Design a protein around this ligand. Structure first.
Ligand code: CLA
Ligand code: CLA
Ligand code: CLA
Ligand code: CLA
Ligand code: CLA
Ligand code: A1EB4
Ligand code: A86
Ligand code: KC2
Ligand code: KC2
Ligand code: KC2
Ligand code: KC2
Lengths: 238, 179, 193, 228
């Protein structure tokens, strides 16, 4: 995009404010590929943080209320039940109590999705380009059209085609709602985690978020026997 | 000096010469400066790589160093200075003498001399016996020469950090006090 | 100058004659022919000696006896340096006599090298043309004619290689002997040789 | 250009990735030969490594799980329940020597000008098809079957189908390389391939030394064992 279009989108997201860049991060040229590339990267970062944050907000609400799945997570005569992962503690403790294979495969599945989004050939095959090259800032390409060898049932966005045949006006309105909901949901999820780590940080939630001891920004806990994990966790931090 | 290579985005496209040593440098003096820089950079790259491999824990040379006199590659130890102290004086003299022969061949054999209008750092034998950097175009070759200069400048600072950690103990962080 | 028209010039000294002291510049051309002949003879003798000294240092010897009482292994036992002393006298005399025959026959060729002939080109059949003397025509160099398969440029390159290897062996054999004499003078030689 | 052919071939292997040469080995002039010869060598090496890796993967499943012929043979000396690392170690020294020697003879036939010229083909580094094993039409004794397609099931296959087959060969060979060395790595650096943890047993010894341990020196010939 350009700064003018970014200002217009800000006006459409909140006409009272309009553009709000106190740091002038849009003019901050990072990656040395022009203001258009920088604004594209920032827009994608906002959209992706928002998507992950709203998803994690719903996940935190669902997991913190004792709504584990009925089926099991590990397989064998001694397998970690999802109920055991629930009983591990609060949601962050559930993640830390996951098996190492579960953690690795979750994060690597997400990584596969991320590189799939970042590749320009698949984006061009699905239409549009990389978000730093004029494409739509936040747009996951089609795992079907990319040409993976086996035919996948569904794409990641809109698997059942419910937003299909949407009005273009509804599409723009939906993207505005996506950005704003993500903007608020980032604060929501970080407020949950901040209440978990520092009690009383978010005054409204008092006694309603379980405590947590380990670092939340540490995907692998002490149970994860992998290279350097224990040495990394040896020294803690606020 | 502005048209001598080695400048990059790290300086900002300009020459890094605050003390003004380039002002008092002629063409021959500038060629000498570049030749010394290239030699020191290459030596420091080799020295850092060797010291890091030896001290880090990499698989060092199998077998004996001296069958008679009973000195072994494993027995020499992983401290760099202690290893260079315990290696035989014959071996030290041999390394130094071969390096000296190569230095004198670099000085004399390359007849268009880097001081007398030649390319600094053009040691003819000791480069690319397998011909890897033979088909590279001038642009990528200049890029790689700048890479040589940058990497080796970093290597010089690295090896001086190593010897500072060995001499002035607890001097550099990320170097255990012994060495 | 005759010094400007030889094969010994090599890139190791640039594309230029290696005469630091001007010895070739302070002499007439005849001495330059003598110099080239002696240089090549020295180089070839030196590489023969160098490979022989390495073989002696490795304690490698033929299966058999160098005389009726001594064994090849026995005379090689002490080492390459004392091996020549331990060789029997008659064998030393025979080596010296055959070398005398070689360096007399090669000298007695009338094109020569000092007086209008190629220096270093030993006549391939030294003992031919000698009246009342017979030899089996085993030509001294290339008895089985390897260099015939080469072109002129190939053998010119190999003559340059000959000069280089001969000079290197000139250094090497004296390195061996000096290392034996002064211990540690040439650190690459173990106490075995 | 050979690099242009390798460019297209990479797109066929995976159009999402395309060419992936972070080391520029195609550009490097190995042995001083030109880019065409170097790329021919690299493609031959890729296809051969892949072929041997897939054969090795199926051999791993056959041996470690237990799949042996019946009768007198090298099979009779390997201990029962022996893992895939130990079956090679347990077959006789002469069995190892003759297996490697037969493989060497096959490769000598592969790179020989004789068979390649009898088939109207050239060496892969000199304008030939990388990874093509010639028929034994120049071997001295007329040989019944050839290595590739011995029953000649692919006598009439389209050139497009053969090209797609070579594209499948390269990818499957690379993947089989990864899996076979996963099996190898799990036995010497445990917890390196997460899925194989607990499946592949540990092995003490040098894999890459072919003749260590030297193995039994038995004499399995029965009818006419005069050489013992
Ligand atoms: C190995 C797995 C993997 C991979 C390859 C990526 C790749 C990426 N992520 Mg990440 N991400 C991962 C796991 C992974 N992610 C997981 C498990 C999550 C949790 C759901 C996220 C959540 C996430 C968010 C919310 C965002 C990214 C972003 C990015 C991009 C920016 C990279 C960057 O500059 O970071 C710097 C890289 C390093 C310092 C290297 C560290 C090693 C990139 C496509 C950001 C993006 O797209 O910005 C435009 C972004 O907004 N990721
Ligand atoms: C042996 C050491 C050595 C030498 C001979 C040179 C020589 C040169 N460097 Mg320098 N340089 C070195 C080490 C050295 N460098 C190191 C380790 C670094 C990394 C910090 C740099 C970083 C650097 C940059 C960023 C640049 C240069 C450039 C130059 C040129 C500047 C002109 C001049 O008059 O310099 C002569 C310099 C000397 C005679 C230095 C002598 C030693 C000093 C006075 C004392 C030691 C200081 C102490 C360690 C702190 C010249 C070819 C510029 C260039 O490429 O110009 C074309 C350039 O852009 N160098
Ligand atoms: C240039 C600086 C330098 C110096 C002063 C030393 C000094 C020493 N090294 Mg060496 N070393 C160097 C570079 C250097 N190394 C490099 C670049 C490496 C590769 C990582 C090594 C790897 C190494 C090992 C693994 C060991 C030593 C050891 C030693 C000691 C005995 C001498 C010996 O056999 O070394 C060997 C020296 C070399 C091989 C020279 C490096 C290569 C030069 C630059 C020529 C380039 C050749 C090329 C790479 C060949 C490819 C084929 C001695 C303290 C031994 C010791 O006592 O360890 C405790 C020992 O076991 N070094
Ligand atoms: C004392 C003698 C000597 C010296 C000073 C050098 C110096 C060099 N060699 Mg080595 N080299 C030597 C002997 C020597 N070589 C011998 C005897 C061989 C034959 C086995 C080689 C074979 C060789 C190869 C094959 C290569 C080098 C390369 C190098 C570089 C070393 C990089 C390094 O430290 O890697 C540390 C690890 C440098 C130009 C490299 C080069 O020139 O790259 C273009 C290279 O590829 N050398
Ligand atoms: C003694 C038997 C023997 C012989 C004569 C050869 C001969 C050859 N092999 Mg080897 N090879 C052997 C056993 C043998 N192999 C075995 C048992 C295997 C595994 C089953 C392989 C796997 C193998 C691969 C994967 C490759 C070779 C390659 C080669 C060629 C060059 C190797 C080279 O330069 O090595 C160093 C000296 C050559 C035709 C290479 C080739 O053809 O390159 C294109 C190659 O990539 N071989
Ligand atoms: C059986 C049938 C008979 C056939 C035989 C054929 C036959 O003999 O052919 C004879 C023949 C031939 C031939 C060909 O005709 C052929 C066949 C075919 C044709 O196309 C080509 C030609 C060529 C015409 C040539 C021979 C040349 C020779 C022998 C050259 C020998 C040359 C020895 C040297 C230089 C020794 C050097 C020693 C050194 C440097 C020693 C040393 C050291 C170290 C200790 C090592 C290390 C130390 O370093 C430190 C200390 O750090 C430095 C230093 C100096 O101290
Ligand atoms: C906070 C603090 O205090 O931190 C401390 C800790 C820390 C950071 C560790 C420190 C340090 C030391 C450091 C960082 C030292 C750095 C050393 C460095 C940078 C060392 C380079 C070696 C390069 C070599 C040998 C390359 C050879 C390369 C070769 C032979 C080639 O190029 C060949 C070739 O490529 C060509 C040209 C053509 C291509 O076709 C490919 C081929 C292969 C044919 C300090 C200073 O103490 C500070
Ligand atoms: C992020 C999403 C995700 C994807 C896209 C994905 C895909 C595939 C595919 C296809 C490509 C296969 C073939 C496959 C196979 C197995 N998965 Mg897997 N998986 C994902 C997630 C998890 C989690 C969280 C766990 C898990 C597991 C297992 C076990 C072993 C179970 C056992 O222990 O009995 C097996 C055999 C559990 C485990 O323990 O893995 C070691 C476990 O907790 N997976 N998984
Ligand atoms: C955690 C995941 C996640 C959440 C929770 C979430 C929520 C919301 C909300 C609720 C607040 C609204 C209202 C909304 C609306 C739209 N989303 Mg959206 N979304 C998520 C993920 C993705 C991805 C991956 C894509 C995507 C898209 C679109 C488009 C398409 C417009 C078009 O077709 O032009 C519209 C209208 C796709 C696209 O192309 O966006 C440019 C696309 O790739 N979304 N999205
Ligand atoms: C290249 C040089 C060379 C040539 C061309 C050459 C030619 C001939 C010919 C033909 C023309 C005959 C017929 C002949 C005969 C004998 N040679 Mg003789 N020889 C050469 C070299 C040596 C050396 C180094 C030794 C030696 C010896 C003997 C002995 C042993 C006697 C014994 O058993 O004691 C006998 C009988 C050894 C020796 O003198 O032993 C005391 C001994 O060490 N030769 N030798
Ligand atoms: C153990 C080894 C081995 C394995 C595991 C293996 C697997 C596969 C797979 C399965 C993933 C496919 C799909 C496939 C396909 C083709 N193979 Mg291959 N192959 C092996 C060995 C050989 C040999 C020795 C030759 C050969 C060839 C061809 C040709 C070319 C046909 C033509 O163009 O005439 C095609 C299409 C011949 C050739 O010329 O290759 C350049 C040839 O000589 N293969 N091959």
């Amino acid at each position: 995009e350009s700064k003018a279009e970014l200002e217009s989108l800000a006006g459409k997201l909140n006409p009272v404010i309009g553009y709000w860049d106190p740091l002038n991060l849009a003019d901050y040229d990072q990656w040395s590929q022009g203001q258009e590339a920088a604004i594209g990267f920032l827009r994608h970062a906002e959209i992706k943080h928002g998507r992950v944050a709203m998803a994690a907000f719903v996940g935190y609400i669902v997991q913190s209320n004792g709504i584990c799945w009925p089926w099991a997570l590990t397989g064998g005569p001694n397998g970690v039940m999802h109920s055991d992962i629930l009983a591990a503690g609060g949601p962050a403790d559930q993640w830390d109590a996951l098996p190492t294979a579960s953690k690795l495969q979750i994060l690597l599945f997400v990584g596969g999705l991320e590189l799939w989004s970042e590749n320009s050939y698949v984006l061009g095959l699905s239409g549009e380009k990389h978000y730093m090259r004029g494409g739509k800032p936040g747009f996951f390409p089609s795992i079907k059209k990319g040409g993976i060898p086996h035919p996948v049932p569904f794409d990641l966005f809109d698997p059942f085609g419910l937003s299909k045949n949407a009005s273009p006006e509804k599409k723009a309105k939906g993207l505005l709602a996506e950005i704003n909901n993500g903007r608020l949901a980032m604060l929501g999820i970080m407020a949950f985690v901040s209440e978990s780590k520092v009690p009383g940080s978010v005054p409204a939630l008092a006694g309603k978020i379980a405590p947590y001891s380990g670092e939340v920004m540490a995907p692998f806990a002490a149970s994860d026997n992998l290279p350097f994990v224990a040495d990394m966790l040896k020294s803690p931090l606020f | 000096v502005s048209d001598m290579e080695g400048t990059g985005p790290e300086t900002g496209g300009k020459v890094f010469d605050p003390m003004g040593l380039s002002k008092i440098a002629s063409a021959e003096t500038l060629a000498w400066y570049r030749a010394a820089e290239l030699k020191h950079s290459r030596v420091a790259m080799a020295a850092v790589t060797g010291w890091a491999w030896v001290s880090s824990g990499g698989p060092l040379f199998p077998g004996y160093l001296s069958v008679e006199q009973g000195v072994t590659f494993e027995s020499l130890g992983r401290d760099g200075y202690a290893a260079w102290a315990a290696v035989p004086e014959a071996g030290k003299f041999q390394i130094l003498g071969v390096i000296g022969i190569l230095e004198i061949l670099s000085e004399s054999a390359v007849k268009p001399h880097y001081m007398a209008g030649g390319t600094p750092g053009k040691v003819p034998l000791l480069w690319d016996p397998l011909g890897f950097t033979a088909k590279l175009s001038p642009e990528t070759l200049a890029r790689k020469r700048l890479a040589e200069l940058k990497n080796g400048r970093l290597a010089m600072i690295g090896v001086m950090s190593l010897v500072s950690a060995h001499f002035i103990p607890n001097s550099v962080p990320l170097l255990p006090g012994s060495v | 100058a005759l010094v400007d028209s030889m094969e010994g010039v090599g890139e190791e000294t640039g594309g230029q004659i290696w005469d630091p002291l001007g010895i070739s510049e302070a002499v007439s051309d005849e001495a330059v022919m003598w110099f080239r002949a002696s240089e090549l003879k020295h180089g070839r003798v030196a590489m023969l000696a160098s490979v022989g000294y390495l073989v002696g240092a490795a304690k490698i010897s033929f299966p058999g006896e160098l005389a009726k009482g001594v064994t090849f292994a026995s005379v090689a036992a002490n080492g390459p340096y004392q091996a020549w002393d331990a060789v029997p006298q008659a064998g030393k005399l025979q080596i010296l006599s055959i070398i005398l025959a070689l360096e007399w026959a090669t000298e007695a060729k009338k094109p020569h090298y000092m007086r209008g002939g190629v220096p270093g080109k030993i006549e391939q059949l030294p003992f031919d043309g000698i009246q009342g003397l017979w030899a089996p025509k085993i030509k001294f160099w290339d008895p089985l004619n390897f260099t015939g398969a080469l072109s002129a440029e190939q053998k010119a390159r190999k003559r340059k290689a000959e000069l280089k290897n001969g000079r290197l062996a000139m250094i090497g054999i004296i390195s061996f002997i000096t290392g034996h004499n002064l211990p540690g003078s040439v650190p690459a030689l173990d106490s075995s040789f | 250009s050979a690099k242009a052919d390798l460019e297209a071939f990479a797109k066929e292997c995976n159009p999402v990735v395309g060419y992936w040469d972070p080391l520029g080995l195609a550009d490097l002039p190995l042995w001083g030969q030109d880019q065409d010869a170097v790329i021919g060598w690299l493609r031959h090496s890729e296809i051969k490594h892949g072929r041997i890796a897939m054969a090795g993967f199926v051999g791993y499943i056959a041996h470690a799980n237990g799949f042996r012929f019946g009768g007198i043979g090298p099979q009779n000396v390997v201990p029962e329940g022996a893992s895939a690392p130990e079956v090679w170690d347990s077959i006789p020294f002469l069995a190892k020597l003759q297996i490697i020697g037969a493989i060497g003879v096959l490769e000598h036939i592969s790179e020989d000008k004789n068979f390649l010229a009898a088939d109207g083909m050239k060496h892969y580094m000199r304008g030939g098809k990388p990874g093509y094993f010639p028929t034994f039409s120049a071997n001295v004794h007329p040989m019944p079957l050839n290595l590739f397609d011995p029953f000649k099931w692919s006598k009439n296959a389209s050139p497009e189908k053969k090209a797609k087959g070579l594209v499948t060969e390269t990818n499957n060979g690379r993947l089989a390389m990864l899996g076979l060395f996963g099996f190898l790595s799990e036995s010497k650096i445990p917890g390196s391939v997460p899925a194989l943890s607990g499946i592949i047993p540990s092995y003490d010894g040098d894999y890459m030394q072919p003749f260590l341990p030297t193995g039994p020196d038995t004499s399995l010939w029965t009818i006419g064992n005069l050489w013992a």
